[model samples]
Target chain A: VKGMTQSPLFLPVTLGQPASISCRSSQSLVHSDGNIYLSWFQQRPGQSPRRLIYKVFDRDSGVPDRFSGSGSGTDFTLKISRVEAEDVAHYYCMQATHWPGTFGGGTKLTVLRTVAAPSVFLFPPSSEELQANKATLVCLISDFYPGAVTVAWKADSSPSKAGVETTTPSKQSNNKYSLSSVLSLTPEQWKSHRSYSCQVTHEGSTVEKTFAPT
Target chain B: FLGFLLGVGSAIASGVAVCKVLHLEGEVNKIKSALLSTNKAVVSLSNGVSVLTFKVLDLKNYIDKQLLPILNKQSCSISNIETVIEFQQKNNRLLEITREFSVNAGVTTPVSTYMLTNSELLSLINDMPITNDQKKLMSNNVQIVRQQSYSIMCIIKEEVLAYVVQLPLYGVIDTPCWKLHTSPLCTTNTKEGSNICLTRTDRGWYCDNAGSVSFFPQAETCKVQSNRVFCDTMNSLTLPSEVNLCNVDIFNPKYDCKIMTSKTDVSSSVITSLGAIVSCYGKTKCTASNKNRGIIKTFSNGCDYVSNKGVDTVSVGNTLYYVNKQEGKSLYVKGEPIINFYDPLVFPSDEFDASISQVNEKINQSLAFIRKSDELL
Candidate 1:
């Protein structure tokens, strides 16, 4: 069984603009018969999977010519020449050259009329937890369009890896999304650090919130 | 002077006697009533005509402003589907109103007349003191109204048919399958309750729990004599539950059998159904022996069916099968035989084609109706 990976897990594109998603396979997809058995599928919101391109570059019947697939070996790309409102969906790439076929983690494409930056808020441990040895910090990201954001935690300007967990973005009532990242710390560690900061990266920009122990 | 006065008096006396005999008062009253009734009929007809005209115009406006733009676009979407359906319902309502108005107007005069003429009122108009030119003018006005209404109806019919044909292309009929091979009911994983299994015999291929299996009974079978050379080929298989199987036979020393498989998630078990084409040659009689073997048997005439014994690894002849917790893996030790499993990706094209034909028939019927209406006119 082979593994596959997809890039730009979340994409925001303007209407009528072109968009592309890249898929990389862990192994070569060329079979002994010299046929590349890679296919691309699209799944719109509230709809099932539709195969757009199969066998590397062959578009399925009735698929518009604007949607094309091209690549060889381990790297493949699915391109939409002109992205329309209907193109808002998730795209996935699969390979069948190996014994067990594998599919990449899907790329979610959103047709954006407006791009909005996400707001980040960091909350210190609650009063009840001040008496305990452990503390939990919460970072809340809200009101973001194209709902793809990467959250990271830092202690005194250094990356914090331990006791960190982030949740998938959840959509709000207004169609924007909110995500929560929780960082656990010992009370002594929290006091020892000069400051703890939560940074959220979205649409090539980053927003950060820092908290210092009083 | 006396003679001229008597002449005038006599003329006046004669005029009075003629008027009395003719019943002039009653004649005047009858004419007045006829004029009154004709006026009322004209007023009612005018109202009906105005309402019908407005409705046809409104229908045309909707088709042009709302529906035509959607159809004109190259791509289809969910919003387009909703828009087309809404326009269709509204068009239906408008058509019903037009039919009702046509019936109420009592304009049964054949289409050739084009005049919204009530038979009784038409005869009254003919007898009335109106001039030929006035009557012609009224008839021409009615003709224009009827002609425009019928023409718009034809236009509406054409556009509505277009909408019907375009509706299915907007993902209505071509819904994608999201949960492929992930459903336990269709998964190829035997442990996940996939009861179907395949075992190849010298006669042909046999499957267990496969419903109404189809096979090539007359195809040649492979026979192996006591020989040193043994050939074994391995391939991947994935089958969706919706498909029974697809098979093809290749005629040669060795046949190409493709076993298709379907998998939704790599972490879950895969779906494998029996999809193979078998054609065997070279007949030789041989026997099977289990002695001097370590939990493996070598059969001379047929293939071996290895049961998965809940073990991490199983070795059968030259092929090594590793039933890993991650994904199913198979390693072949001998020749590299290339076998491709063709998964049957079912699209709803059959249903879509049927719907398109049905819509076309309706359009044809509508066109016929419009032609028939024209014939009546």
Candidate 2:
């Protein structure tokens, strides 16, 4: 226990999300024997440490495959594929390449379970805009969670279809997702007084809007 | 008459078509002027840059879809599009300027990674063969370029803000120790609640106060010497001067008030922040109690006073002196005579004369005793 050093503190992470906690060692983990002597562990409150990954990247006998160890020489990272309820504990990284073993200060993974769906809107070209030759219809969807959603469009009484030119779904700092799409048509087609609709499907629920010429 | 009427109708129709062409050309000219101004504004962005780039990108995309096709349909003069042409050229210049700073752009090994450090970036700007204007473009956007570097560093904890800041601390607590660390000048505390400056090196537990440039090893158990302030751990250790600080005492809970000797210092000195030095030795345990006097300290074995006018004679960290309101037999250890063995000290003259005789009598008695001892031998 001569030169053991732990991280000065830990990090908090969101629950049920991808989390990566890092532990840095003072010594190079690359041993003369050509092996990286790094390992990761999880410690639940009031319990001992459980080895999650050993020898750098090998999963412990009973540990799940989602946990991993990586990096070498003073820098090491421990990653969780998806944070689980029980994974909301302290994580530590250890190195044994030298005479004295060291561990990083534990990083705590905190999961916030509040989930939400985005708000959707369909803004079709107004009649005046149609006359001005602005023929693109915009569908604005914002505040969705988990970043997965389906957006489609329809013309007149036609069935909902694809071919939508949507922007890449972008996530906000608050962890919610927002996206928009454009449905273009010729001015003559827009002036034909056809109904345009936008439909958003998220989290097994459907929220759609249909806009008709007034 | 029919031939004349037909010729006039043809002429009128031609005239109307020309007027319409002229009007449409005017509209095209206006749009082109505004577009060229926008391009000029963007190119002029070396002044500050940012909003200009955003607007230019949007305009570039709009020109590709809307203006170019519309001009093609109207049979307008495409040659008049200096804005579109200049915009593309400047955009290419921007990319070129930015590319020279590419992690792969430098002569360093990996001459191809997409990451860079502050000094590395400065090196690229200085070493790259780009023109001054191109270099200026890259240099002017240094804030944004550095931001790109930050993004790369953020991918790994070792290169992140915490690690970058920790680099200055020399492998102590990194930024991930996200908690507030106390000043480096203060004595290092290794407790979990303390700031991140303390660590376990192979030598021992070392700490650096935010204020100090040097790291103190074996700080956890190191004690303050009798005449030392809290921060001096080197001379305070009770060990050989060469092995001033050993492993054991740093971890020991007791034995403070350094009662040790350094092989390096037969007589160690404590230097105060006000440029005062109290030199002392510990063979017999000495202390320098005052700084106001020329030399207001004692050796580890004995006490030396320069100015003592206080009412109480008690020794402590900083204060040391005493005074007697009742001019009784108070020991004035400092005078023409070093010591006064006058038991019955009276008024000023009597006291002075008594001390003089006391000193002379002691000197004579000692010399006489030495002579008798020699005869006996």
Candidate 3:
């Protein structure tokens, strides 16, 4: 009678408006007394699941006030005020009321990018002396209003259809969006000193940065 | 060169002859010594025997003095042999019981039990021949035989019996135990059982799961339960148990136990305690696949967790738990710095400059902690 209980397999939330992540458990979270054993967590990209709420409603210290949880028993929901670009992450609800702690599948938040051109800065990997190794050409697109930004990469000013893979951009603490695309090229590429260029296009204004292979 | 070579060769031949004679002499002495020790028991028995005591003199005279003495010695020897044979039989039976218990408890050739048995058992242990793999396995699970022998001995002495079993929790480099180099987080599961190694990274704690690897980046602490690895990244790795331990007590090495000067020890015991507590909880208490395996608790703010755990927030600073813990008699998880030599983020003051640089100095400046840490080789 005690084991892992699954919740709704998936949930979809809109970008701009407020959204609630719902996690329905099989059993009542409420005990015979007033104690309720439930918690909410958000799992963002490249990071671990962060506890948003503990004991149902008490927000974890330093967690923003905008994030809150409500509801009781089997019906529990984590509510966010005006979903921001940073809120685009997977959400899960867990109950510790019974034996074999149970958790719901997850709810993913989808943020619709409100268009604003990204501030692009191209720099080399943090090395004082530039040596020919597995060097990285970082195209840091920071302070972008919209969460999403399109990037183009080229070697020696020649574009490739198979562009460099970029990691998903996450919101920093400064309320700014920063995304970086790393170009891992061999010593030949660096020694050859080909003209490497990174182009960014956002809100109809195209931006480009060119670097000498040296 | 040829003339010298001939002379040297002849000298070597003479040397070889000498060595051969010495070797033969040494070999003969060893054989004689072995025979003497082996047959020494027969001397006492021979004393009572009267088989051939000057029997060449004459049948009647030989029987009266010498033969009679020899006969007496032989008669005493027979009784001695019979008594020894009976005792040997009983000991062998008890040994069989002990050997069976050891085998059932996972010992192939119980060397500890060999002492009680006869010379034949000792020879069996030496000549049984063991493979490297089996030998390694037995050594790894040596604790089993240890308790196994103790239990068997207790039964032999006090007529009491007890039982306990364990998995081969082998700790090694690249294994689920702990390593100084390479990925602090790695898990390799063989047929023996799943071994999980949990470690901390820059972002959060990661769990080297059973075979497949995983991480809880942004967690406060990581743990393993029932062969499964778990981690908590967002919360501070603080335990529910509140004990009064100075920052130095949990963090410093034993050499530095009493070696404190006025120069201020920069050890952070909070992180040490957290790591120690998590590691200890996992190895000893963390149950698997059950309700007992509770979710790893994390603090919203590393500072709040430090405060809640009853330590000065200033002592731990802003950074989350940043060190590793070892399982031991003490709760403090004593360890070295994750980074050798000097760590940039050891204290909070190091962050003050970076924080100052991040703020917009004019319009209600807000300090931003450096998230994307830059490193140089």
Candidate 4:
């Protein structure tokens, strides 16, 4: 999004249950004291913004398990689950974690929303060449609290093959992260015409997605 | 008296035998002389000095087989032959020379005229319809006039003529020889489908075109009508490469133009009647006996100036040629010979402006030398 002008956020998540907040900061964050600082806000229907956790993920100092903080120094992620009716407002995680701390636009946690599965979001291939060329499929994971997450490749949107992975060379320093995998077919028969998938297993659940792009 | 008469008769028989042997020797010498002249040019080809002339000839015998009826004599002519030449600029000033050479077969009409220009070529690649950046490339260095020599040639493809040509006895015809190619010059001189010099690394020889023309500087003037094919090796990319070298026929439809030859143009009958007399008689067919007759060509150097190299040294392979008609001075040069008192004959290079005219003709009508070398090899 280097040349991008504006990007908006519209919640299309499943209703009920503790809400998971995703914030794609406009820019990277910079701070101190564990990198350095972060702020999460939760607003109810008729109230002011209640600071879920301030200063940092100083959770050991007394923050609820429903509210946890984990991420890189630059991208501090704040996830909250088991939300009651009172928790049905807007929530956003901000990381003054790096240079130019950014906000994740705004996520409106609606009481009755579509059955949107936020776990798996299919990231379509950008061009026809990726599919046409020898497919070097990969499952990229971004914007998540540091925890146990498993990523794998799938056939037409189903989990099926072994994944070989390596960390992608960072395009630039600062806010971004990348990972990739290379695939080779067996002599008898190599993989072909298979959709690539990235599944981030975190928060006691599996968030999966698939995409078929030309 | 009986003994004396017997001795005299024996002496007479011996004398007759000697005379017959002498007559056969004379016949052998006659054949050797003519073959010597044709093979002379070939044997004389220097090991590596550069400039060389390669000639191809096809000859026939009066009779097809030993038992068949014999005719008067065989007919042989240059089936296909071309010379490689390079030219240099006289001064730094730019001059145009394409108009001087027509490369025409008939005296007045031309088969094809080259019109490639540097700008026109660039335009083709840059046209809006072709958006790819790979087609058009900018020149990275300044252009200079150069001359190169190339002599290597290999037939990647070969196709025998489907038709046979009828040849007459005591006749010869020197049809057009194969052509050469040149690389693209600078920006203004580059044109696709145009007869402009193209580089070998960039573009290759596509069709028949003359060899590369060299550039030299001396006496503040450009001299030499014919030179080595050095510059030729650096230029020209051959297209339909195999077919061009081996005289092979194309598939049903060629890319841009059509093939002019037919099956009948090169059958065994046509070549035999034309005097393709070289045979595999244990020894080479050529002997020191017949003159004013043709020789076979099939893997030797074309009409060279040397003779000791043997009969097999002067033949060009995969192609055939026969004569139409000839008697006296038409043996060596192309046209009717001119017996003059004022001046003597000389190789073409002795003339002024020979470089420009010779190279200009090659660029327009024949294959470039660099391309030939690659193709031949």
Candidate 5:
């Protein structure tokens, strides 16, 4: 039998302000050792998860007193007295009381800050490479922050699926992210279509770029 | 046998015209030579006519049964474009041969089948849900075929009536070499039984047979066959004859709950109790109360009882439940609890998630920077 855990999906907090995340377990956390076995872990950006609180409220070694845990049985809460820039990470609650330990879905704590939209640029296949049977079209997305973006390609206003590849967003030196997607097409397909388009969706906003072959 | 008779009749008619022409020129020897040549021409022409008759019938059958139906649907894939082009090329070739034979036989009226105009054909292609480039390609091919057909028909009419004075000598009755009556492709023939039934569902249209069903999109074009249903969206579904469609009500929701005893323990009892609470929530309404313990909880349609421990006050239409079971207090409810809890508090980070990708990219960039510095040393 597996136990299910629940936590808040997202919580936005101001810098230097307090924040609290609630986690509920499907089963009770009372162990035979006569102690609650719920624990809280924090995973900073680009780092692995590190336990902060164990045994319901006991702080782990080197963990600051600002971070604490409370509650019992099936319900627990993780509280941060003051949110910092480094606290912009995911927080999770796990229980080891049962036979099979279970972890709650992590909470994404986003520190309120300026959000930037990515710039989209589309490039058609070069004329010099027209001799080849296959051509690749590239879409460049650069200078975006809070890096979630979806890329899509269209040929002659119809969604194209075959021979499309998108790279993961790469961080740049300026604290921004850049991504690129390429669409491969046959020479006939490249010349036949009237136009091609690339779209990038960031946060709730979307930007599109289009090109037509001469 | 009919083709042979028609061929001989046309040959005799062409021979009579040649004889009259020779006689009017007033050369007995030439007339005799021309008659001999006319007999040879008639022999070859008759054979050509006989072969052409069967070819025309086959072409007509294909157009009526296969080509027209597909075109009428107006939904052609990229592959289907080639099929239409090939059929048009073949059709134009046949029309050219018919025009040539009709003119040579000295028939006044040209023989041709009913064909859609270039605009009509192009309109059908334009209506297809394909790219603009594909439509343009198909339009160009169709126009070429139509132009060739028009050229052949013009030549037949201009040449057949060139010698109006000598037309009476040929005296050929103007009749179509082959009847061009078009029959409907889909005929409601009850003698040929229906084999499949179509049902509309919340998902899409389904082909159902013996309680087994396969789904196709609602926008698909389907045709009924003798032993199967053919849909453009998917492969054909096969079924036996004698089928009828039935409408099903999709509004009714079904909820199933079963309590099975398998090695009962304290933990299992808690799970069973949770299951009972969930089952209770599935019903229209329920109440959990303990008069002896001084606790009562009334749940409406939307309210759910998640925990065994009672709450301070019954909040109207509240989905959240606080379960804190106290000793010596037993509560009774109808069924299991329908608890709505977030399975995972946060959405998993995908390849596109910015926070993770940014950090990962930064680390890679820093590593590359460090390697560059070491290389300088």
Candidate 6:
């Protein structure tokens, strides 16, 4: 099966390290040979399976290197390096060069929970409008079901969670709750474009939204 | 005071109308559920017909790309898409034979037999009388277009061949096929020979086993493949050379020639093709038109499947397949959104009236949407 793409049938990865995804074919690709029928896809539950990789792992035309696959034979795999908090779900592999076109029953990656911390991703809280000296900062945490957590800011550049004004609230609808925090800073606080962060501590992980006026 | 009285009257009328409509709708749903149950088998047959109808593309795609060269290189026979369609329609093994020959074979459907039969068989071969449940199916919209059951018979050529005896895959939806909608989805052993409309919440009308579910929108029928009938690798019956002796050329015009486009085109060829469809359904009109039985109050619909979200990834050994599920929302009739005056008593019917006038209005709106889509296309 030249140029035939083979993706991970099950998401195979080690828990302690960054994940590597690889895809390969039975033969060196040749549109002329007509054997290279390959494409890769990922299907999360509920939603329609999306073409994560397609027509030779050409990532839906504007292919990305991040979600990649490599290797040949039946020994191929698709990996997502540095599995982010959001990289949970079943992945699939498929090829049409053969009949009864087959697809890999995707493997789901499980994020190991430990005492270290929980997962978090922050979008620079949308630019806010406030008085010359007053800056409003907000943080949002998503991809977490049963949104339960607390938010606050560190007084110093200390990476430690100590002395943070934590405010954990009750649950809201959609299995997630959101909270915003603002501190009235004087002109001095705005001068340095301070490294103030709106961090959310849920479970054991701290996800933060950080902003400097710019 | 006049304005207020008129408003009050309209409100009262709407309220009463909505109530009556609901009461009727509940009865209709029951009828629908019952009709769906009764005709589940026939409705499923419609699915097979429709599926076979559509799989013409798969055959075309397969032959045009995969099977052509090998056939040409080995058999010294060069085949066109039309020839492949003809081969399948007139006889057996368009897909399976091609697959069997292809280095990369697949579980293919027999497109040749269907292509051979074409619209001639498109109409109901089974004009059999409707049972009460079938009557309810006719009352609803799940028309029976055509039907078939499996049988084993010796071919005229003295060859023993099991056949897919075309048992009138009915046309027009309103028949006992309607009862299949509400049949208790079959469980365990009973599912194999029947079209069980798999009633699972997680999977909708799909299951690993021949779980219950209608494959097509109309004429839900069961898989009546007795041990005697021979199903080709592609689920088509194995035909003896005698029954399938039609010239491959005569058979190519089955499905690809079928049209979803309007007939208002000025093209000379299209006009001719349209004539064929008109003629086929035309000859079968008396039976086809009458078979649309009315509402089965027991027909159950509007149920849903549950979905769970998870992280995404894939591994090699296992192959994944997604079942194409038609949602209640997608299958919904063109429901007019109304203010409803916020009154429970004057809200809306369970289903929008899918009448000609209403459907026409929606179709016009749909055309406008399609016109906009053309800009993108």
If the candidates were sorted by their TM-score against the true structure, best first, what order would they fall in? 5, 1, 3, 2, 6, 4
- Give model 1's TM-score versus the native structure: 0.29
Q: Considering every candidate listed, which one attains the maximal TM-score?
A: 5
Estimate TM-scores for all models: 0.29, 0.22, 0.26, 0.17, 0.32, 0.19
Worst 10 residues of 1 chain B by lDDT: B162-171
Candidate 6, CAPRI quality class derived from DockQ:
incorrect
**Model 5 residue A111 lDDT?**
53
Report the lDDT tens digits of candidate 6 across residue range A91-152.
66666545445654345554443223334544332334333444444344444433345666
lDDT of 4 by residue, B15-83 (tens): 233233324324334333333223112112112221112112111110122112222236433233321
For all predictions, the C-alpha RMSD in Å is 41.0, 35.7, 47.4, 37.7, 49.2, 34.0
> Candidate 3 chain A: worst 10 consecutive residues by lDDT?
A2-11
- Any runs in candidate 1 off by more than 4 Å, and if so which? A1-11, A22-36, A43-50, A55-77, A81-86, A104-106, A112-115, A129-134, A144-161, A168-177, A187-214, B1-377
Q: Write the per-residue lDDT of candidate 2 for residues B1-377, one digit (tens) a residue.
A: 00111111231233233233324324334333333312212222122321111112233444554466767766676666775775575355335424654443222221222233444455456544556665664465454334322211111112111001100001222111000111111111233232111111122222432332222333332333332212223322122221212233332333121111112222222222122222222343334333344444444422233223322232334434332222223232333211122121121221111222343455467667878999999
Identify the leading candidate in terms of lDDT.
Answer: 5
Which sequence of candidate numbers ranks them by lDDT, best first?
Answer: 5, 1, 2, 3, 6, 4
lDDT of 1 at B302: 24
* Residue-level lDDT tens digits of model 3 in B254-312: 21111111111122223332332212211122211112343334322111122123221
Query: What is the alpha-carbon interface RMSD for each candidate?
Result: 28.8, 25.9, 48.6, 47.4, 44.5, 11.4
Please give the DockQ score of every candidate, comma-separated: 0.00, 0.01, 0.00, 0.00, 0.00, 0.01
DockQ of 1: 0.00
Q: Give me the runs in candidate 6 sitting further than 4 Å from their true place.
A: A1-17, A21-35, A113-214, B1-377
By summed lDDT, the worst window of 10 consecutive residues in model 5 chain B runs over: B178-187
